[PDB]
Symmetry: D2
C-alpha cells in the first residue's frame, strides 16, 4: 500500500524517502538553515524529502533542561518551513489534546515508541485523519505491530507508516533485526515501512556505522529512512540512493 504525502509517493516499492531534520526546534533561523541544507542535498541527488523536528523534548535530562520552543511557536516555525520550501513535515505528539492542532499544520504525525500502547493517544491521532508514523517499541516483536495497526483501523485511519527503531538487547543496547522489516510487511498489509537509523544507534567510527546500518536495512526494500546531519550527509545519501535504486529495480520474489 502506498501513501501520497502531497506530491511524494511513499511505499515499499517506490524510491526511498528521506525523513530528517533536527532533534528539537530551538529557533526559526536555525531551523530554516538546517532545512535548507537537507533540501539542497536531497534536491541535487533527486531524493524525496520530509523535514522532521520535535517541538518539545518530552524526556529532558533535567527538570530544568531546555524543552524546545513548545507547541504554539513550534507550529509557527513548521508553517514557515512549509511556505519557504514547499515540503511536508513530520513531528511527534505526546498528549491527546496536541493531536488536532498539530495535525492542522504537520503532514505526518508521529506516535512515539514508548507511547505506542497508549489507547487515548492512538485514538486522538487516528481521528485527525492525518498520515501517522508508528514507531515500533523496543520491546515489541515485529509480528505484534499488527495489533497497533488494528487499533488505528478500528479508529478509522489507515494512512499508517511503520517505523523500525531497534530492539532491546540486554541492558542499555539495541539491535536491529533485519528480518523484522519483512515480518511487518507481511503481517500489516504491506504498509510503508521506514527505518529510523539514528535512534537505532543511540546506544552504540560512528558515521561509518550509521552508513552500514542504513545500507543493510535499505537492502530489504523499504519506503524510507531517517538520518541526522566534510559533506557527510551527501556522501551517505549518494550510497543509499545507489543501493535503493538497485534493490527497487529487482522484481519482488
Amino acid at each position: 500500500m502506498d501513501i501520497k504525502i502531497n506530491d511524494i509517493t511513499l511505499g515499499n516499492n517506490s524510491p526511498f524517502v528521506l525523513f530528517g531534520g533536527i532533534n528539537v526546534l530551538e529557533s526559526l533561523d536555525s531551523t530554516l538553515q538546517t532545512c535548507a541544507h537537507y533540501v539542497e542535498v536531497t534536491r541535487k541527488l533527486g531524493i524525496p524529502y520530509i523535514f522532521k523536528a520535535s517541538f518539545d523534548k518530552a524526556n529532558r535530562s533535567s527538570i530544568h533542561s531546555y524543552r524546545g520552543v513548545g507547541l504554539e511557536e513550534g507550529l509557527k516555525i513548521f508553517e514557515k518551513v512549509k511556505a519557504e520550501f514547499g515540503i511536508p513535515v513530520i513531528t511527534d505528539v505526546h498528549e491527546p489534546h496536541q493531536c488536532q492542532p498539530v495535525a492542522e499544520v504537520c503532514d505526518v504525525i508521529q506516535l512515539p515508541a514508548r507511547l505506542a500502547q497508549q489507547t487515548d493517544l492512538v485514538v486522538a491521532m487516528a481521528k485527525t485523519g492525518n498520515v501517522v508514523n508508528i514507531k515500533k517499541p523496543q520491546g515489541l516483536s515485529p509480528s505484534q505491530m499488527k495489533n497497533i495497526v488494528e487499533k488505528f483501523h478500528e479508529a478509522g485511519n489507515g494512512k499508517l507508516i511503520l517505523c523500525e527503531r531497534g530492539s532491546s538487547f540486554g541492558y542499555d543496547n539495541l539491535v536491529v533485526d533485519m528480518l523484522g522489516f519483512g515480518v511487518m510487511k507481511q503481517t500489516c498489509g504491506n504498509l510503508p515501512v521506514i527505518f529510523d537509523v539514528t535512534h537505532s544507534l543511540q546506544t552504540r567510527g560512528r558515521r561509518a556505522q550509521a552508513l552500514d546500518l542504513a545500507l543493510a536495512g535499505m537492502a530489504t526494500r523499504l519506503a524510507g529512512l531517517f538520518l541526522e546531519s566534510l559533506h557527510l550527509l551527501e556522501d551517505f545519501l549518494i550510497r543509499i540512493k545507489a543501493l535503493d535504486d538497485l534493490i527497487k529495480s529487482q522484481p519482488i520474489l
Copy 2:
C-alpha cells in the same frame, strides 16, 4: 530509607507490604468485595496491605475495552475503600492534570513504566508531595533508575518506591534479573524496592510460576510484593500463597544483612 504510609512502615528491612487488588475499577460493590477478601486474609496473617486498582487503564488491548470508572467516580470508590477498611490505597496517573486530585485521596501515586521518562508527569507527580511508586520500564537497566530518582529529587520529592516489573528478553518475553534489586538499592539510596510479580509474568501451573518468582525475588530482601488477583492469581488461593511469602520474608528479614 523507610517510608511511612499512614501506620505502615515500608522499607527493605521491614516486614513486606502487600500491594494488591484489581486491574481496573469496574464497580463499587465488586471492588469492596475483592478488597474485603484481601483485608481478611492479610489481617489473619498480620501482613500490611495496600489496595491497588486503576481508575483509567490507559493501555487496553482494544480501543473500546472499558477504561474503568474514570477519575471522579474512581476517587469516590477509593474514598469508600479507605473509610470501610482503614487501609491505604494506590493508583496510577497518566496525565499531569490528574496528579493533584488523585494525590488528595490516594496514599500512593504510581508512575506507569511507559511514562517514566515523561518529564512533565514526573514533575507534576513530584510536586504533589505524595508517596510515589516508580514502575521500572522493561527496557531500562537497573543502574539507570537513579536518573528518574534524580528528577524527583530535583523537583523536591524523596518519598519514592522503586518497582521491578521485569526486563525485555528477546521478543515478547520478560526476565527478572534478581541482581537488579541490589543494583537499585545501591545506586538509589536504599529506597524501598517492591516486586510486581504479576506484570513480570504476563509474557509467560501459572500459579506455581508466580510463587516461584515471588519467593525468589523476596529472598533478595525487599520492601514489598505487588500483585493482581482475578475474582493474575486466583483470589481464593491468596491465603496459601501469602503464607509461603510471609514465611520466607520473616526468615530473611530476621537475619542481619551480611
Copy 3:
C-alpha cells in the same frame, strides 16, 4: 527423580547438596587444604558435600596460560581426596577418550556447557554409567534442556543432573531466569536441578551479589548449589554464606509442594 551418590540423596525435594571446590587443580597439598575446609564447614552445618575441581582448563584465553595438573596427576589427587575424606567428587571431561578413565575415579562427571552438543562426548560419558552433571549452555532455553536429556536417555544413562549457569543477555552479560528451574523440572522428568551461581555472575560487592543470587535460586526449591571459592567467593566467608543458604533451603523444603 532422586539420585543416590554414595550415601548422598540428591533431589529437588531433598536437603540441598553443595558441589564446591576450586577452579583448577594446581597441587595435592593445596587441594587437600581447600577440601578440608569445605569438609569441616559442611559437616558441622550438616550439608551434604561433593568436592569439585577441573584437572585441565581447556579454554584459556592464552595458549601459554597455566592449564592445571592434567589428567594423570589430577586423578591421583582425586583418589587421595576420596581416601582422606570419604566424599564424592566431580570433574569435567572435554574429550571422549577421557571419560572412561575419569569415571573410574570420579563419582560425577561433568559435561561442559560449550560441549553439550558434541554427540561423541555425550555417548562416551553416558556409556560410563556414572552420574552426569549437564552444564546448561548460555544459549539454550530451559524448555530445550530436554534435548540433551533425550540424547543421554537414548545412550542409556538416566542419572542426570541439570545445572543452571545463566543465559546470554545482550553482549557479554548473563541473566538467570528464576522460572527456568521450574521449566526444567516440568519438561525433564523432575531430574535434580542445581544452580551454578559462580559462573552465572562472571560477567558482573561480589559477595553480596552471590548471596542474593544464590538465595533467589534456592527459593525455587532446588537439589543443589554449585560454587567456587578462592583461599569466586573468599574461602573464609564460606561458612557464613552457607549458614544463610541452609536457613532458606530448610524453610523451603519444609513447605509442602504446590
Copy 4:
C-alpha cells in the same frame, strides 16, 4: 587483509565468494552430483565457489544421525572434487589429531563455533598452516572475536576467516547484528568476514524470502563471502540478486577519512 585460496582472492574488498555444499559426505557419486549443481550455477554467473561438506560431523541433532563417511574415505572424495572441478574445498574438524591429515587435502579448515575456545583444537588447526574459517559463537560478542584471532596468531597462523552466524536473542531466537561485521573488521585487522545466513535463520515466500533479505542486508555491509548450510533456478535467482548488490557495493570506494 586478503587471503589467496588457490586462484580465488577472498577479501572484504573482493568479489564475494560462495561457500556451500552438503551437510555430510555420503558417497563420491552423491557428492559429485551436488557439487556439479553449485559449480554450474556459480560458473554461469562468474561467482567464485568453495565446496563445503563434513566428513565427521560431531554435533548432529541425534546421537545416531550419520556423521559422514569418515576421514579416510572423506578425504578421497574431496580429492576427487578438487580434481574434477578445480575448486577449493572446506570441511570442519573437531579432533586435534585430524587437523593435519585433513589439511593435506582441504584448502580451508573450519573451527566449529562451539569449539572455538578449545585451545588444543585451535593450536592443532593453526599449526597446519592452512586457511581457517572461524565460526563465531552465538554467545560471543563481536569485539571478543579478536581473542580467538590472538590465539591463532600465537600459534603461528594468520590466514583466518571470520564467519558470522547470529547472536542469541532471548530464548531460541537468533538475531544478526549488522554492526558486528564492522566491529570485527576494525578489531581483527580487516580479516575476511563471511556471513553464514542459514544458521542465522534456523530458529525463525517463507524461508527463501527471509534468507534473501538477510543475505542482502549482510552483504550490503561489504563482506568477503556468503556461507550456506543445507531450485536449481531458485539458487540461481538468489545468487543473481546477491551478485548484483555485491558488485554495486564492491565497486564503490570505502567511505572517505
